Amino acid sequence: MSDIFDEAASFRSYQSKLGRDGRASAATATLTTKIRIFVPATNSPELRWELTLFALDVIRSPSAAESMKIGAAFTLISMYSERPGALIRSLLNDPDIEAVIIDVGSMLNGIPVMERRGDKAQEEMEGLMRILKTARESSKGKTPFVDSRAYGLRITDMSTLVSAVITIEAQIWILIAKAVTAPDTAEESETRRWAKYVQQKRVNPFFALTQQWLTEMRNLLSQSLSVRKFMVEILMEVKKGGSAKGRAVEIISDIGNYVEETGMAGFFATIRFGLETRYPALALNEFQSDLNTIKGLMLLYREIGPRAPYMVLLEESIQTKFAPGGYPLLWSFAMGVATTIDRSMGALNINRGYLEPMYFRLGQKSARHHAGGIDQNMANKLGLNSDQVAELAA
């Protein structure tokens, strides 16, 4: 009767937020891994330049352990800040890892431990020398930068160090946009971002890393989750306005503008196209369940919080519920109308197992052959029937 079909809606709403309530216990505590991070102790430009060169070499090194690579990545990311240790310690929310901040102090060819020399330090020094030697020998004499003069470059001016560091941060931060979604199909959007930032003169093109180093760093970023979590935390903190933003922070926020809502193109495309742009072909007895699921998904997305846009980057378990597969019909309709309407829509790889070609064809027809689609008109267009006819005439 009347009561049923509403009890169903309440049941689905309750099932969506079924057990996602309360607070968990500390028993489910992940084992922690020690990660050694080399941060610059002082503000001298030469020390910071040598440190970032060392971090580039370590990241490029093939014999480097994963923990050393994560340490080098953390050193690189926090290089712009005047207090990298404070930035790392105050913007770390990774239960998987524990970070031991190490102030570099002075600067040799590698790093001088300067803590009980001879006792448990010489082995670390030889290890760092081996890492550097393997990094330099692995490449065919090619420096990490696309320009050989950028590697063996002496930096003593603060402005030059700042420019080079900003360029390195920009080139690193380009990769996060398509690091886990489709790392193989990258180097096109990344090149577009690099060209955009070069044309804006925000980055000096002299310090441009080669594509081999970029591929290695992207592979490291995709393999590791702690680096992604740290960078997402940095993005969230920068997104919060209120204070003055520096050049590095502004570049990071501009990149995060592209980073947001990555890996969830299906859901947002479904929203924008199938749900909005109201077409008379919506209520047809095969889209009502999908509409209810979509509404529940919007409520869940609002409930998640500030980490919702970067759900794929943090690899949230909630992301699976957002993926198409629970609403294949409306999703297929929406991507059909998207591919017919948006030219850019159509390069997306959507050869899934629930394509529903009938509904894709229905959406394709609904986009063009359906009708002009005159929605409720606040202004009284009494004589616009001929206008609608002319618009549909194309």
Question: Which of 35, 50, 42 lies closest to 165 in space, CA to CA?
Answer: 50
Classify 96 as helix, strand or coil.
coil
Of 78 and 143, the one with the shorter C-beta distance to its own copies is 78
Q: Site map for RNA, 237-276, x if CB under 7 A?
A: --------------------xx--xxxxxx-xx-------
Q: Site map for RNA, 347-376, x if CB under 7 A?
A: xxxxxxxx----------------------
Query: Cα–Cα distance between 196 and 201 in angstroms, integer?
Result: 9
- 200 near its own copies, rule: CB under 8 A: yes
Q: What DSSP string runs through 143-194?
A: -SBSSGGGTS-----HHHHHHHHHHHHHHHHHGGGGSSS-STT-SSHHHHHH
Q: Which of residues 33-52 bind RNA (CB under 7 A)?
A: none
Strand partners, 209: 145
Alpha carbon separation from 159 to 106, 228, 286 (Å, rounded):
21, 29, 62
Of the residues 182, 284, 299, 390, which one makes contact with RNA according to CB under 7 A: 182
- 278 near its own copies, rule: CB under 8 A: yes
Alpha carbon separation from 169 to 29, 33, 140, 164 (Å, rounded):
33, 26, 25, 9
**What minimum distance in Å lies between the beta carbon of 76 and its own copies?**
14
242-250 contacts at long range (C-beta below 8 A, 24 or more positions apart): 246/80, 247/162, 247/166, 247/202, 248/80, 248/165, 248/166, 248/169
- 120 near its own copies, rule: CB under 8 A: no
**What minimum distance in Å lies between the beta carbon of 324 and RNA?**
5
- 320 near its own copies, rule: CB under 8 A: yes
Q: Which two tokens stand for residue 378?
A: 């606040």
**Beta-carbon contacts of residue 180 (< 8 Å; ≥ 6 apart):** 222, 228, 263, 312, 313, 315
Q: Tell me which stretch binds its own copies (CB under 8 A): 54-62, 116-124, 138-146, 289-297.
A: 289-297
Q: Count the site residues for RNA by CB under 7 A.
A: 41
Helix H or strand E encompassing 34: strand 33-39
Of the residues 178, 218, 228, 229, which one makes contact with RNA according to CB under 7 A: 178
For residue 380, which amino acid is it?
A: N
- 351 near its own copies, rule: CB under 8 A: no
**What minimum distance in Å lies between the beta carbon of 77 and RNA?**
20
- 241 near its own copies, rule: CB under 8 A: yes
**Beta-carbon contacts of residue 179 (< 8 Å; ≥ 6 apart):** 186, 218, 221, 222, 228
Q: Which of residues 318-337 bind RNA (CB under 7 A)?
A: 319-320, 323-326
First-residue to last-residue Cα distance in the chain: 47
Of the residues 42, 93, 156, 211, which one makes contact with its own copies according to CB under 8 A: 93
Instruction: Please give the backbone phi and psi of residue 103, each rounded to the nearest 5 degrees, phi first.
Output: -75, 130
Tell me the chain's radius of gyration from C-alpha atoms.
Answer: 26
- 169 near its own copies, rule: CB under 8 A: no
Of the residues 132, 231, 238, 264, which one makes contact with its own copies according to CB under 8 A: 238
**What minimum distance in Å lies between the beta carbon of 390 and RNA?**
28
- 284 near RNA, rule: CB under 7 A: no
- 285 near RNA, rule: CB under 7 A: no
Of 152 and 382, the one with the shorter C-beta distance to its own copies is 382
What residues make contact with RNA under the rule CB under 7 A?
177-178, 181-182, 185-186, 188-189, 192, 195-196, 199-200, 257-258, 261-266, 268-269, 312, 319-320, 323-326, 342, 344-345, 347-354
